[PDB]
Structures are given as C-alpha cells and as structure tokens.
Design a protein around this nucleic acid. Sequence first.
RNA 1: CGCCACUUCAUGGAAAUAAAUCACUCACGAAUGUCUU
Length: 97
Amino acid sequence: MNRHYLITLTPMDWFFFGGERTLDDGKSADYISHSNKFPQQSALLGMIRYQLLKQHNLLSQFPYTENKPTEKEIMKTLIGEQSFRMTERKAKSLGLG
RNA sequence: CGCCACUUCAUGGAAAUAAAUCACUCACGAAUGUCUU
C-alpha cells in the first residue's frame, strides 16, 4: 500500500549541479560556472517524476500538444499536477502523485 | 810512348697544430570574459 525504496545513484561521468547562475540578474550569465556538491531536493523529485513518466510511456515529445485530457488526469494522479514550489511550504501533503 | 776501365743510384726527421663550437631577435600577439531559448 505504501512501498519504500532505497535509490543509489552512481556517477558514470563528471556531473554538474547548477548554482545561482549569477550574483545578480537581468541578462548576465556567469563566465565561471561552479558546481554544487549536491543537487537540490527539487532535482531528485523531478528525476523521480521523469522516470515515472518514462516507465508509463507518457512523455512530452516534439513541439507542443495538449496531452489528451484523460492522459492529463492519469499523469496528474501519477506524478501530481505541479512541480516543487516553496509557496506550499506549510502544506500537510506533498501535493504530488 | 803504347794500350786499357771499373764502382756507387736515399736514407734519417717533421705526417698536422692552435682560435672560434653558435651569436642576436622574437618566447606567444589579436578576438571571445559568456551567448541563445
């Protein structure tokens, strides 16, 4: 009913985890891009959602579509209807699928 | 005064010695220091 897994990630090559991308904003990029030693938990959650959408073959491919609202419902109940945001940081549930 | 020829056919020494053996210049120059979604 509620199965728990342990997921181990083995780096097969050199990895790069993004930073602030800038000490300011506007249009500037950073000439030196530094790698965080750890990814954000948002990255882990998005990886889980993407892999779940890969197992159940419901992926967003090539320009743009509307994804067959029944498929929209199944994707909502699989991965949730929304990404990780800190607006719902006090919500009692993860809000995902 | 007459008559008359033989012998010998390079050895020893020096057989390369000093000077210069790379020198000067250039030893990186210019563009890009983030860009497009």
